[PDB]
């Protein structure tokens, strides 16, 4: 049994465990037979080309299906009266009721609406015709081919880079900062100024005329002579670079000329930043030299050894990358609703809900994975000798202080936050809603006031943003923060207080599980030699009291539940606060979010009505029938996860042995024999499969609920506003 070829341990297994574990360990390239360090980095570099190519093929498919089956040009002519189309439906299982429910009014056939926001992205970038979308689709498929060729080419023996090339940290940082961040942002500022801003002006600039179309009438003469204010001046032609600040009151979105100036300003910062480190020209910083100098008296050896720790551990590098991506992904979610960039996207409420929820769940997975590879680092790559007394080894040295205080904060938050919700629920039940514990969120209102929100009893400490940000942006910023129908610093009250501490509970508890798993990854009192067993192993048996879920992998598994719970609390709160805004029901949110029955009744029960009426014996089907079916599907998958999570292996293995008996004794069927002996799934596999069903069922249920409740009850809104002075 030669599959899997990378593991002769697995390949000689005569059971069905050979197939499952070959799949599960296929991308764990470090643990494969015959792997060297150099061949690992060469395989990764080419694998990363393949992943890049998949991203561009995915984007070209979205572009093709919107161009070929969508209604982009019909939507461009009428952005309020036209629902954007993702792709057509051809499903032979459809009856006549389903075909007409998905066929839009006057339409040719059944289609899916689009909630990815791609139309608003394509329109804001300046695309106006289907030929724009089709040429994007071809270009990304060609770009995908180039990366596939590059990955293949850099596996050829003349082009495989050396291990010293992959470990040249200083050159990679200089190139990724200056070109991959800086020049790419500079190029995007070029697209905005040459293409997207003239398209917003109504001037079609494309490849056929952009060489002979000045983006500014004075073109490039103010740039080189240092007279840069001409690009901001309305009397010297339409401006291309401004700092108005705030949101455009006609659109409710960011100023395009602000977006262009933003990407130009940060391009200069990133290009300058990528001149910091020492490559082959004598000048620049050695990263090892910077880290070794930063050694103070309280933190022992400081950062000495951390260069060779990070540069020789891919799991450390990946954990740092995942954590930073996860923070930035959350920041994308928080700033996309608060400061939207895309024309007609704040008016599409379903898209704003879908995008916030998508990116917060992605950020939650990236955060858990960052700590997972931090735990893998400690078992596989952490050398205590080369990290002697530095800041890394000192974390492990006071790890009982870290875990016990994280345990304290989570219990401190959890006892009182739950206690306050329960207090308010009992008050509402007994007819005493004026005896609720309603705590005013004055520390966060303090933050809003420092940015120029006018809130009566809360002081501007330094004197307000007139003192603290006296820039050119200040009039447009203050006009957008104090305006009605403006998403910047939403009004908050006691319901916002309680859920923010519930969120802080979920953040501290998920961190506690992840940090304890990463810090007890190498060993504990119950298992002092745990690093000799690895990241993922079932247990150490029933001795010493019993040791189920003792591995660092099992702490990942436990924290996924807590991450899903925390992001659930975050996205429930975003959705209910915004559908109360969109639905003109903010007073209901402020009244009912302070106790948990209000969340059950006014959020979950009330907004389930269009969803579960998506198909019915009385009224047939409508467009929500697919979300209604997915909503039930998600409940089924989630509940199926419970079977794997609760009923553990030895039950199933004894059950399978009777089935093995039955097959071998049944006439006409015992002539057919398995090649691999049926066994129950392993202990770790049962946890993983149970977590997978739990997670998939969690996400599909909420996505069906979030989309169908928003698209039926709160689909559209104005998003224009009157600025405040």
């Amino acid at each position: 049994t030669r599959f899997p070829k990378f593991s002769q341990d697995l390949a000689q297994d005569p059971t069905t465990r050979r197939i499952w574990y070959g799949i599960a360990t296929a991308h764990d390239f470090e643990s494969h037979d015959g792997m060297t360090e150099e061949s690992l980095y060469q395989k990764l570099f080419a694998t990363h080309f393949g992943h890049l190519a998949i991203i561009f093929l995915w984007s070209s498919g979205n572009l093709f299906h919107i161009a070929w089956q969508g209604n982009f040009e019909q939507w461009v002519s009428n952005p309020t009266g036209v629902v954007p189309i993702a792709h057509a439906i051809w499903d032979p299982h459809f009856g006549k009721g389903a075909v007409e429910a998905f066929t839009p009014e006057g339409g040719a056939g059944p289609v899916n609406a689009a909630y990815s926001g791609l139309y608003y992205l394509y329109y804001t970038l300046g695309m106006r015709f289907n030929s724009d979308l089709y040429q994007g689709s071809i270009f990304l498929m060609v770009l995908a081919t180039v990366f596939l060729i590059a990955g293949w080419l850099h596996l050829q023996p003349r082009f495989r880079p050396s291990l010293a090339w992959f470990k040249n940290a200083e050159s990679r940082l200089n190139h990724h900062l200056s070109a991959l961040f800086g020049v790419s942002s500079l190029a995007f500022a070029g697209h905005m100024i040459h293409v997207a801003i003239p398209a917003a002006r109504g001037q079609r600039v494309d490849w056929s005329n952009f060489l002979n179309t000045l983006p500014h009438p004075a073109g490039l003469a103010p740039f080189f002579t240092g007279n840069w204010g001409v690009y901001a001046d309305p009397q010297a032609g339409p401006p291309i670079l401004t700092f108005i600040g705030g949101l455009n009151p006609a659109t409710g979105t960011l100023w395009l000329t602000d977006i262009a100036h933003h990407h130009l300003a940060i391009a200069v910062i990133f290009i300058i930043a990528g001149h910091m480190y020492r490559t082959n020209f004598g000048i620049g910083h050695s990263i090892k030299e910077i880290l070794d100098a930063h050694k103070g008296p309280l933190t022992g050896e400081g950062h000495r050894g951390l260069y060779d720790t990070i540069n020789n551990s891919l799991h450390f590098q990946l954990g740092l990358a995942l954590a930073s991506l996860g923070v930035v992904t959350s920041l994308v979610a928080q700033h996309t609703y608060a400061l939207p960039a895309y024309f007609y996207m704040p008016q599409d409420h379903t898209t704003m809900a879908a995008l916030y929820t998508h990116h917060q769940y992605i950020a939650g997975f990236l955060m858990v994975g960052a700590f997972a590879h931090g735990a893998i680092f400690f078992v596989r790559d952490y050398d205590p000798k080369a990290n002697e007394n530095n800041v890394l080894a000192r974390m492990l040295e006071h790890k009982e202080a870290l875990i016990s205080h994280l345990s304290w904060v989570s219990l401190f938050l959890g006892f009182h936050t739950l206690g306050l919700y329960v207090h308010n629920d009992v008050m509402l039940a007994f007819g005493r809603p004026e005896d609720q514990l309603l705590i005013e969120p004055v520390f966060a209102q303090f933050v809003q006031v420092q940015s120029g929100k006018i809130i009566e009893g809360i002081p501007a400490l330094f004197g307000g943003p007139g003192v603290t940000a006296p820039g050119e942006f200040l009039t447009g910023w203050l006009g957008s923060v104090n305006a009605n129908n403006s998403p910047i610093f939403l009004p908050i009250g006691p319901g916002d207080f309680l859920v923010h501490h519930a969120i802080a509970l979920g953040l501290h508890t998920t961190t506690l599980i992840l940090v304890k798993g990463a810090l007890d990854a190498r060993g504990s009192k119950l298992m002092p030699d745990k690093k000799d067993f690895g990241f993922a192993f079932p247990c150490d048996g029933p001795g010493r009291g019993g040791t189920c879920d003792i591995s660092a992998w099992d702490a990942f598994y436990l924290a996924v539940f807590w991450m899903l719970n925390t992001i659930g609390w975050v996205t429930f709160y975003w959705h209910w606060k915004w559908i109360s805004i969109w639905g003109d029901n903010v007073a209901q949110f402020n009244a009912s979010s302070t106790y948990l029955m209000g969340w059950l009744r006014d959020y979950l029960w009330a907004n389930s009505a269009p969803l579960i009426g998506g198909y019915s014996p009385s009224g047939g089907t409508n467009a929500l029938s697919v979300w209604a079916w997915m909503f039930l599907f998600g409940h089924l998958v989630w509940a199926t996860g419970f079977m794997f999570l609760i009923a553990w292996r030895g039950y199933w293995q004894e059950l399978i042995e009777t089935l093995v008996w039955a097959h071998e004794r049944t006439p006409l069927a015992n002539l057919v024999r398995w090649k691999d002996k049926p066994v129950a799934m392993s202990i770790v596999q049962g946890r993983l499969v149970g977590l997978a069903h739990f997670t998939i069922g969690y996400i599909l249920t909420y996505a069906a609920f979030l989309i169908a409740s928003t698209a039926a009850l709160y689909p559209n809104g104005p998003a224009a506003f009157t600025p405040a002075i």
């Binding site: 395989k43 080419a46 393949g50 093709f64 070929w68 596939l148 060729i149 990955g151 293949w152």
Partner: peptide, 29 residues
């Protein structure tokens, strides 16, 4: 619109990406 010629062109570009993916996936294995 996306005419029938442009659908056919897109599948030819997709076929070339397919053989490129075939080159990479066998060099990776």
């Amino acid at each position: 619109v996306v005419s029938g010629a442009q659908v056919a062109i897109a599948f030819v570009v997709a076929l070339i990406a397919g053989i490129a993916a075939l080159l990479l996936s066998t060099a990776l294995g």
